[PDB]
């Protein structure tokens, strides 16, 4: 049957979930989804029920998402609680260290400091900093509170054993568990920092709005980012010590219900939920408050499908969660390289062993999946597309090392010379040759430029049809692609048009204009490509498109390029960054010109000389370029992306 089985945690929640059951009969067809409700003692009953496929769905604090996801329960998130408005949703919030204006101290510097807390057990103000300060505590790390009490010098813990250990209690004498305590809650431990008892202050992003009305007072303050820098309060989204869910329907990970338990609460919302006034309603109860969803919920959002717990809570969380629940600390150590096949596998595992492991290798199917494992650690690098390098940032990795190849190469418009009539101005019906879809030389760029003329992204109704691999099968812009049955018009190896190559193939072959790279016409003309296509082609039968409206001849592509491209370029976490530069050009001042591939093109691009510093250009939007940036902004309106979508869903 159509059955989400919720699981509740006490006899008020069975009792709401009872009466959630019986209206929703009144609402929804026969064919519709119902709700069956489990009575368990305990989030953790509830968790151990939904893996026991004897439950489908509980809502769990961020705590609970992360104990629901370990073996072996294997849960996910699959529906958020918001708060609040649409535009501004308020699904998570962060957590913070709030600190004074030219206190003249980093994250790395909090040892002997002045420490103010929400209250001990508390997440945004014990669970995350003490989480993340884990292993910087002094050994013996058991019991936790002598610890904290032996790294701050003194501190206001509300609710810590200020008997056994006074110096948690400085601050606030007593530790006051209660409002009673001047130092308590969110506003407490705020007014600790204000009020000058403390240095850092341990509260969420909203706290210091909820209590400074004038900016000019908020600029007396700044936040600590992990990075070791600081940071204006408002710029929380960039330096905070991790993001927070606030309530989470999850499910089992396989044959889960997500889809179900989504079209219940979506129904559940539109007949039941804020404001909807019925006798029934789904955010409060006569039994109590916050049964089974937060009374101060507005509403639900779908998780989007990519999302697994480790994203969900993201990076900075499951570090400071993963250190209080196993309490493990250790003695740069190896990069863990991620490959995207068995030919990128064996030219990765060869690395390893030539380099004394400094090099590990951990491989995954797309590119996609490699980069969600250097956001959450299974990984740590691996080199991009331009297009690829702004999805790793949109998703919170950063460039580090760029590969050079001589400001670097140069994305062209290729004809075939005889169609002498085609120019870049009217394109218009005619047959496009693209690398892939969100890649720099065959769409970024191209389709950027293109979207100013036309004021749109559909650009299957502009080009007649295409090969442009990475586009939903039954396009316009599939039909000239070359794959075989699953492989057709996919954007790996096992399409014979996928890539500069392949594009260049498909303009031979079948299209009207190829979006290129300068390098690629030459590199496969002149026999140099023995490939039965490329063999007997000749240079000069091609053009490029120039942007005037002219054409010019392959080799002049210096005054006939669309635009610049930003250079491909390896990618970590802010956290590796300074480990990433130093083993890999200690790699490549070793194996660099003294990246050549069994296969081709594996790793790093074949014509790559050197990876080049970035300097002040670490962030996406500052190594890519304004110009670039705004394309995408306008393209992503019809980009497809399943993890983008996860990481937007996450930072709008
Ligand atoms: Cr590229």
Redesign the pocket.
């Known amino acids: 049957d159509k059955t989400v089985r919720w699981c509740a945690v006490s006899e008020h929640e069975a009792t709401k979930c009872q009466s959630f059951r019986d209206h929703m009969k009144s609402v929804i067809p026969s064919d519709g989804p119902s709700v069956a409700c489990v009575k368990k003692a305990s989030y953790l009953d509830c968790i151990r029920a939904i893996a026991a496929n004897e439950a489908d769905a509980v809502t769990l604090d961020a705590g609970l998402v992360y104990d629901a996801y370990l073996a072996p329960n294997n849960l996910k998130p699959v529906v958020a609680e918001f708060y609040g408005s649409k535009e501004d949703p308020q699904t998570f919030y962060y957590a913070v260290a709030v600190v004074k204006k030219d206190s003249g101290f980093q994250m790395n510097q909090l040892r002997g400091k002045k420490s103010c807390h929400t209250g001990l057990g508390r997440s945004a103000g014990w669970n995350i900093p003490i989480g993340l300060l884990y292993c910087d505590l002094p050994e013996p790390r058991k019991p936790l509170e002598k610890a904290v009490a032996n790294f701050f010098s003194g501190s206001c813990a509300p609710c810590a054993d200020g008997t056994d250990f006074p110096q948690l209690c400085q601050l606030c004498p007593g530790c006051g568990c209660s409002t009673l305590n001047q130092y308590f809650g969110y506003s407490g431990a705020f007014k600790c920092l204000k009020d000058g008892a403390g240095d850092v202050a341990f509260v969420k992003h909203s706290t210091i709005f909820e209590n400074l009305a004038n900016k000019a007072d908020r600029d007396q303050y700044e936040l600590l980012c992990l990075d070791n820098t600081r940071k204006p309060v408002d710029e929380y989204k960039d330096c905070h010590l991790a993001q927070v869910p606030s309530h989470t329907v999850v499910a089992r990970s396989i044959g889960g219900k997500e889809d179900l338990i989504w079209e219940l609460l979506n129904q559940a919302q539109e007949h039941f939920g804020k404001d909807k006034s019925k006798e029934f309603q789904l955010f409060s109860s006569p039994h109590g408050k916050d049964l089974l969803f937060k009374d101060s919920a507005h509403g639900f959002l779908k998780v989007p499908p990519r999302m697994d717990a480790k994203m969900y809570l993201g990076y900075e969380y499951v570090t400071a969660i993963r250190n209080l629940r196993e309490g493990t600390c250790p003695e740069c150590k190896p990069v863990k390289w991620c490959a995207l096949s068995h030919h990128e596998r064996l030219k990765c595992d060869e690395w390893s062993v030539n380099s004394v492991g400094k090099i590990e290798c951990v491989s995954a199917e797309t590119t996609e999946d490699c980069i969600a494992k250097i956001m959450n650690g299974e990984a740590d690098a691996m080199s991009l597309?331009?297009?690829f390098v702004y999805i790793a940032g949109k998703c919170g990795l950063v460039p580090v090392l760029a590969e050079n190849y001589n400001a670097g190469?140069f994305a062209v418009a290729v004809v075939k010379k005889s169609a002498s009539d085609l120019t870049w101005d009217n394109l218009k019906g005619k047959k496009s040759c693209h690398?892939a879809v969100g890649?720099?030389?065959?769409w970024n760029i191209p389709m950027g430029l293109l979207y100013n003329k036309i004021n749109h992204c559909r650009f299957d109704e502009f080009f007649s049809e295409g090969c442009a691999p990475g586009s939903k099968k039954d396009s316009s812009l599939c039909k000239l692609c070359m794959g075989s049955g699953l492989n057709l018009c996919e954007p790996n190896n096992k399409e014979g048009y996928y890539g500069?190559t392949g594009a260049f193939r498909c303009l031979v072959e079948k299209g009207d204009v190829a979006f290129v790279?300068h390098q690629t016409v030459p590199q496969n003309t002149g026999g140099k490509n023995p490939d039965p296509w490329a063999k007997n082609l000749n240079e000069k039968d091609y053009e490029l498109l120039c942007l005037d409206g002219t054409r010019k001849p392959v080799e002049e592509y210096a005054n006939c390029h669309l635009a610049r491209?930003p250079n491909?370029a390896v990618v970590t976490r802010k956290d590796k960054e300074a480990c990433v530069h130093k083993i890999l050009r200690q790699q490549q001042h070793l194996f660099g010109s003294n990246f050549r591939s069994e296969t081709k093109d594996l790793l790093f691009?074949d014509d790559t000389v050197c990876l080049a510093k970035l300097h002040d250009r670490n962030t996406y939007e500052k190594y890519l370029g304004e110009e670039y940036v705004k394309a995408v902004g306008n393209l992503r309106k019809c980009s497809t992306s399943s993890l983008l979508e996860a990481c937007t869903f996450r930072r709008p």
């Open positions: 597309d331009g297009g190469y690398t890649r720099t030389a065959g500069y790279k491209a491909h691009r």
